[PDB]
Design a protein around this ligand. Structure first.
Ligand SMILES: OC[C@@H](O)[C@@H](O)[C@@H](O)CO
Ligand SMILES: OC[C@@H](O)[C@@H](O)[C@@H](O)CO
Ligand SMILES: OC[C@@H](O)[C@@H](O)[C@@H](O)CO
Ligand SMILES: OC[C@@H](O)[C@@H](O)[C@@H](O)CO
Ligand SMILES: [Mn+2]
Ligand SMILES: [Mn+2]
Ligand SMILES: [Mn+2]
Lengths: 498, 498, 498
C-alpha cells in the first residue's frame, strides 16, 4: 500500500444522446474494454475508474460535481469517442477544480478500408470529436493536458501515467503540513517568503512550534525505546570506533536516537509531513538534529535547514511524486566547486542533513564529530557517497508576486579520491551544459542555495509539475544558451506578471 | 535631545546665469533672510540648512550627490527663486535618493504696483520658474511635494513642517530594527507576510531571536536592580492590595520587573527599536510580558502581539513620527462592541499590552491576575482609561503584491459606566462615519484586527506617509460612502498593481 | 593618460560572522592576494580597489553609500567568499546607483579531496553564498551581471574586463555634452527625438548654439595659427596638386583649417565631447565643415550630420568605449549598393565626414572639390579606403516611448576596383547574413540611415551596453532569420513597453 492506492483517476467518455441506445452501448463496451485493459496491463500509477457516459449537459455537470467532492478523485482523463458538443461541458468544466487530460485515442488503429461505412463513421469519430472539445478548453484558457495515440500504445501509456502522477501529487500537496521548529536564519532572504501565498497557491500549510514544545517530547522518551533504536543503528550502519560501545562518543549516539524518537513522535502525533530546524534556536536540545533528520527524510519526510519551509515542502512533494520509481530524492546544498578544464564539478552537501535514499553504499558510516555551528554537542550523522547517474536539482523561489521553479539537469559522478577528513555525506556532479553557464543562469534567475536533488524524477516530470500549478519553469540544461535564456526570463516576466 | 536633532532639511535655491551676478547676489540675500527667519520663528520639526545656489548642472548634481551621502540630510526643500531650466536638474534628480518638496514661494507678499519693472520681473519669477521645475518632476514621475504660499505664511509653515516630519520618519525607518521573540501565532494570516518585501520597500528589518536567548538575559538580572525598579513602580502607579509588600501577588510583580529589565537590556544591547512576543512560545519565562511591554512602549519602543511585526514596526514609526506633538500612540485591538441606536461604541484593548501614553489618569493601576491564554503565571499589568478626543486607528497590511494602509478616523469617548471586572486597560470610541459602515469598509479592505491607535497623529499625516512610501491609503471617515469606497478600491488596484 | 585612469572598480568581499574572526582573517588574505594578482597580471581596463569586508548590514550600506559618492567609482564587483545573508545587502542595494557584477569565483581551483574538512567548507562556500546573493538581485529585479570561473582563469578575466569597460562607459556618458550647431534637417524623422528623455535615460545632454556663435570664434582665429595647422596637414596627408601652395584650391584649404581651429576652440572652451552640424544652416561660414570634422572625430570627438545628436552621442560613447582596443570607430551612412550574385556589397560614406581612424592608408588624400548640398565654397576633405575585417554598424533610435539599439554584424572588404571619381572616403562591406535579409531586418526594425561603424567593438560589447542601460538590442547577423526576428520584435515590444 502506497499513497497512490488512496487515489483514482476517472475515465470519462464523451458522446451525445442523439445517437442510439444501442450506438452508446457500443461506445460503453469499448470504454469498459479499454479501461479494463489499461488497469490490468498499462501499469499506471493508480487505478482508472470508468464513469457513466457523458451524453447530456446535466450528466456531465453531475460527473464534474461528483469529481470535486470525491477526495480520492485526483483527476479526469476524457475520451471523446463520438462528437460531444462542447457547450454540454461548459457548466461542468466551469466548476471543475480537478485536473483534466484528453486522451485523444481511437478504437481500432488500422483503418478498415474495405468495410468502413457511415455506421462506423457515426460511432468512431474521436478525430473531430476531440478537436471540438480542445476548443472549449483553449477558449476557457483551462490547463487541459492532451495525449494522442492508440490506446494500446505503450508510449502513450507512459505519458498518461506521467500525468496521473502529477494529478496525485497536486491532491496530496493540498493536505501537506509543514512543522517549523523555530524561525528562519537571521538576515537570510531566499528562505523567507509569504506562507499565506504558498497555501493559497499550492495548498500546503506552514506553522511554527516552539523548540521547547519539541524538547518536552524528546525528554519524555523512554530509555528502553532509545536503546532499541540504537540496536537498529548498529544493524543498519557501519559504526566507527568512537560510536561503538565503550566509544568516547557513545553517549552522543544515544542522545541522537533520543532526538530522533522525540521528533518522530511529535511529527506523527501532529500529522506532519515535513519539517524544518534552525541552528540559531536549539535551546533544550543536546545537539543539532542530524542523524534523526536523515532517517526521517529516508522514511519519506520533507526537510530543509535553517527554517527553509519552501524546500522542505518541495522535498516532501517530490519524494511523494517519486513513489514506485527507481532512485533517491534529498535535501541538498551547493557546498564547493572543483575547477578543471573539461571536468568542472560541484560538491553538494549540508552541515549534517543529507538523505541516505541517494546513497550508493549499502551501509553508510555513522559518526560523531565536532560541529561549531549552533554551539552544541558533537552530533551524530550518516556519512556516505551519492549514486551515479542522471539527476535534477530543483529550487522553488518566491519572487514576491509569483513563484519560479528552477530546474538544472545534472549528472552525478564518482568521487575520484576518498574524502577521509570530510565528516559529512557528499553528492558530486557535472552541471549541464557546463559549470559557468549553469551557475550563471541559476544566479541570473535567482535560484536558492537550497535545492531538492533527485535521481528518481526528471525534467519532464517538473515541466508537468510547473504546468499543473501554473508557475514559470526555468530550465537549465545541455540546450541552454544565455542570450535565449535571458530573453525567456523577460518574456515570461510579462506573461506571468498578470 | 530628540531624534529630530539628528537630522536636517536642505534649503536649496534654484536659479540660472541669464541676468547675474548681482541678481544672484540679491537671490542669495533673500534666501539667507528667509532661511534664518524660518529657523528662528517658524518652529519646524528640524533645522533648515541653506546650501549654495543651484545655477549650473554640475552644481545641482553636486548638491544631490552630497544630499545622498549625508546621513543627517532628510530631504530637500527647493525654492525656484528665478527661472532655473529643468534639464540642469535631471542628472541630479535621477540620482537623488532623498525626498523633495517645492516651496512655491515669493520674497515679497504684495506686488509693488507703482515700482514693478523688468529688473524686479527678472529677479522674482517663481511664478514660472516653479512650473518649469514642476514639469520635470511630473515628467520623471517623481514624488515631488509642493506647497504654495508666502514664506511668512504660518499656514504654509505648518504644511512645510508637516512634510519635514515625514522626511525625518522615512530616514529613521531605514534604520528601524524589529526583534521577534518567537514566530507568528499559528494559523493566523494578517500578521504574516514577506519580511524581505518590507525591508526592500520601507527599509526596516525583521529577524527572530529564540525566546531562550531572552530568558538567559532575564535570568542574569541582579536582585538589586529588580528591587530598584519595583520602587519606581510604587512611586509611579496606584498599587492594588494584592500587589503591595505582603500581597499574595507581590512575587508576580518582582518577576514582571525582572522580565522588563531583561527585555530592556536585550533590546538596548541589540540596538532594537521594536519587538514582538508570542503567547504560544514562552518557554523559560514565568509569565507573558505585560507590564514590561507597556512601559517599554511608553519609553518609545514599537510592539505588537503574537509576532505581528508589521504593526510593531508601524507603532515605532508613528511614535517617532509624533515627536513633539501632544501625545498618545499605542498598540490596539478591537475587543468588543456596544450596539445602541445613536451610540454605537467600540471597546479597544489587548490581553495585556496597552500603552499608558494614551492614559488619562496620571496614575494607572498596577494589578496582577489570571491569564489563561499562554498558560503561565498571573502577569502584572497597568489598568487605565483612555483620553478623550479625535484619534486615528491605522493598519498596514500586506496584499501579497503590495502594501495597503488603512486609516479610520475615530473619536474616543468617556466610558458611561465603570468596568470593575475588566483586568485590562481600555479605549472606547465612536468609529466614523458610523459603526456598521466603518467596520464594513474596514473588513472589505482587509484591515487587520491589530492597529496603531493615536491621538497625536491625524489623517493628513498618514496621507503624506502613504505618498512618501508610494502605497495605497484607504480612508474611512465621515465622508465615506460604500459605493464610492468600493470604486476607489478597484481603481487603485489596477494603478498600484502596475 | 586615458579616461580609464580617472575611474576604478571596487572589489567588495561578501561574508558574515558565523565562524570568524580567523576565518575572516583568511578571507581577507585571499581577497588581497586575488585583487593584487588581478591588478598586476589580468590587464583589466582600470584598477580594482579592494574594500573592507562586508559582514554586517551597516558595513554593506556604508560601502554602497561611499560607492555612490565617489565619482571615480564606476561599479562594484562582488565576491561572496562565504555565505553572506542577502537581507544585509538590501538597504545598500536599494540606494546603490552604480552597476554591480558578481564574480562567482573560488580561491582554490582544484578541490583538495584528501584534506577537505568542515573548516574548508565553512571558509570556501561561494558555491551557495553566491546563490543567496543572486536571489536578492533577481528578487529586486536589479541588473546584476554574473561571471563564473576561477580567479586565475584568463577567459573569466576577459569577461570581467569587458564588463568593467561598460561600467566606465556608463559613468562617462553621464557627463557627455553634445553641442548642436543648428537644428535637424527639415522634414527628417529618425534624427529627431526627445532630448529630455535621452538625458533622463543616458545622462548625456544636448543643447543648441547658434551657427553665429561659432562663426564669431572661427573669425577670431589668428593667421599664424591657421598657417601652423596647414603645415601639419602637409606633413600628415598626401596633398593633391589643387591643394598645394600655388594650387587653385589652396585658399579653400586655409579656410578649412580656420574652421577646424574655431570649432576646436569652441568645443574645448565649452567642455563639449560631441557635436553636430546642419548644411541647411551655414550662415557666416565659408564652407560645410569637412576636413575639420574628420580630424576632430579622429581626436575622439563624437559627430553626426544634419543635427543628428543621437548618433553623435553614440559615436563618442563607442569611441570612449573602445579605448585601448585595436581601433577604428566612425560616423557612417549607407550610400549605395552593389548587387551581384554571391557578392552583394554595401558602399558606406558621407557627403564629407568620415573618420580616418578606420583608414588603411597611412596617408589619406586631402582634396578639395565641389559640393552642391549647402550651397557653399568647395570644402576640403580627407579621401581614403577603409581597413579590412569584422566590424559592426550600430544605430540608436527613439521609438517615442523607448530606445532601440540596432546592431548589424558586417565584414569590410577591399574594393575590387578603384573609385577615381568619388571625392569622398569609402567603406565597403558584406552585411551578415546577406544583403537582402540584413537590409530588410534593419528596415523592419526602423534603424536609421546614420550609424556608428566600428572595427574595435563587437556584438558582445553592444549586448552588454544594452543590458547596462536596460534597452532592447536588435541583433542582425549570420544567425538571423526573419520569422524568428519578427517574433522577438513583438515579444520585446510588450516587455519593454511595460
Ligand atoms: O532664462 C529666463 C527665461 O528666458 C525667462 O524667464 C523666460 O520668460 C521664461 O520663459
Ligand atoms: O487565539 C485568540 C487570539 O490569540 C486572541 O483573541 C488575540 O487577542 C487576537 O489578537
Ligand atoms: O551562515 C552560514 C550558513 O548557516 C551555512 O553556510 C548554511 O549551510 C547555508 O545554508
Ligand atoms: O537631402 C538629402 C540628405 O541631406 C543627404 O542624402 C544626407 O546624406 C542623408 O543623411
Ligand atoms: Mn543550508
Ligand atoms: Mn492580539
Ligand atoms: Mn547624413
Amino acid at each position: 500500500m502506497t499513497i497512490f492506492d488512496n487515489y483514482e483517476v476517472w475515465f470519462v467518455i464523451g458522446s451525445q444522446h442523439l445517437y442510439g441506445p444501442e450506438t452508446l452501448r457500443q461506445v460503453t463496451q469499448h470504454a469498459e474494454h479499454v479501461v479494463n485493459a489499461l488497469n490490468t496491463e498499462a501499469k499506471l500509477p493508480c487505478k482508472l475508474v470508468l464513469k457513466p457516459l457523458g451524453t447530456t449537459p446535466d450528466e456531465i455537470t453531475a460527473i464534474c460535481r461528483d469529481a470535486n467532492y470525491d477526495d480520492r478523485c485526483a483527476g479526469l482523463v476524457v475520451w471523446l469517442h463520438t462528437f460531444s458538443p462542447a457547450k454540454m461541458w461548459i457548466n461542468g468544466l466551469t466548476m471543475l477544480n480537478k485536473p483534466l487530460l484528453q486522451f485523444h485515442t481511437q478504437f481500432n488503429a488500422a483503418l478498415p478500408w474495405d468495410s468502413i461505412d457511415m455506421d462506423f463513421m457515426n460511432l468512431n469519430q474521436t478525430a473531430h470529436g476531440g478537436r471540438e472539445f480542445g476548443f472549449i478548453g483553449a477558449r476557457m484558457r483551462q490547463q487541459h493536458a492532451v495525449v494522442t495515440g492508440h490506446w494500446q500504445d505503450k508510449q502513450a501509456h507512459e505519458r498518461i501515467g506521467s500525468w496521473m502522477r502529477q494529478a496525485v501529487s497536486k491532491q496530496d500537496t493540498r493536505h501537506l503540513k509543514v512543522c517549523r521548529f523555530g524561525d528562519n536564519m537571521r538576515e537570510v532572504a531566499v528562505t523567507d517568503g509569504d506562507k499565506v501565498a504558498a497555501q493559497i497557491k499550492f495548498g500546503f500549510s506552514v506553522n511554527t512550534w516552539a523548540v521547547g514544545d519539541l524538547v518536552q517530547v524528546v525528554n519524555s522518551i523512554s530509555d528502553g525505546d532509545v536503546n532499541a533504536l540504537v540496536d537498529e543503528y548498529e544493524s543498519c550502519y557501519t559504526m566507527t570506533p568512537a560510536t561503538q560501545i565503550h566509544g568516547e562518543k557513545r553517549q552522543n549516539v544515544l542522545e541522537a536516537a533520543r532526538i530522533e524518537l522525540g521528533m518522530k513522535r511529535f511529527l506523527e502525533q501532529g500529522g506532519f509531513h515535513a519539517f524544518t530546524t534552525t541552528f540559531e534556536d536549539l535551546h533544550g536540545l543536546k545537539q543539532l538534529p542530524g542523524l534523526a533528520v536523515q532517517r526521517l527524510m529516508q522514511q519519506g519526510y520533507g526537510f530543509a535547514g535553517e527554517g527553509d519551509w519552501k524546500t522542505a515542502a518541495l522535498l516532501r512533494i517530490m519524494k511523494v511524486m517519486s513513489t514506485g520509481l527507481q532512485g533517491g530524492t534529498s535535501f541538498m546544498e551547493d557546498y564547493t566547486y572543483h575547477f578543471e578544464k573539461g571536468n568542472d564539478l560541484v560538491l553538494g552537501s549540508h552541515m549534517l542533513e543529507v538523505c541516505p535514499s541517494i546513497a550508493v553504499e549499502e551501509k553508510p558510516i555513522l559518526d560523531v564529530q565536532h560541529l561549531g555551528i549552533g554551539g552544541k554537542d558533537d552530533p551524530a550523522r550518516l556519512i556516505f557517497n551519492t549514486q551515479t547517474g542522471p539527476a535534477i536539482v530543483a529550487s522553488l523561489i518566491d519572487l514576491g508576486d509569483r513563484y519560479r521553479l528552477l530546474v538544472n539537469c545534472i549528472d552525478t559522478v564518482k568521487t575520484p579520491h576518498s574524502l577521509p577528513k570530510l565528516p559529512v555525506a557528499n553528492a558530486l556532479w557535472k552541471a549541464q551544459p557546463d559549470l559557468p553557464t549553469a551557475s550563471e543562469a541559476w544566479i541570473l534567475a535567482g535560484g536558492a542555495h537550497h535545492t531538492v536533488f533527485s535521481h528518481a524524477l526528471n525534467l519532464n516530470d517538473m515541466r508537468q509539475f510547473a504546468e499543473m500549478h501554473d508557475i514559470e519553469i526555468t530550465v537549465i540544461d545541455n540546450d541552454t544558451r544565455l542570450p535565449a535564456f535571458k530573453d525567456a526570463l523577460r518574456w515570461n516576466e510579462v506573461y506571468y506578471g498578470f
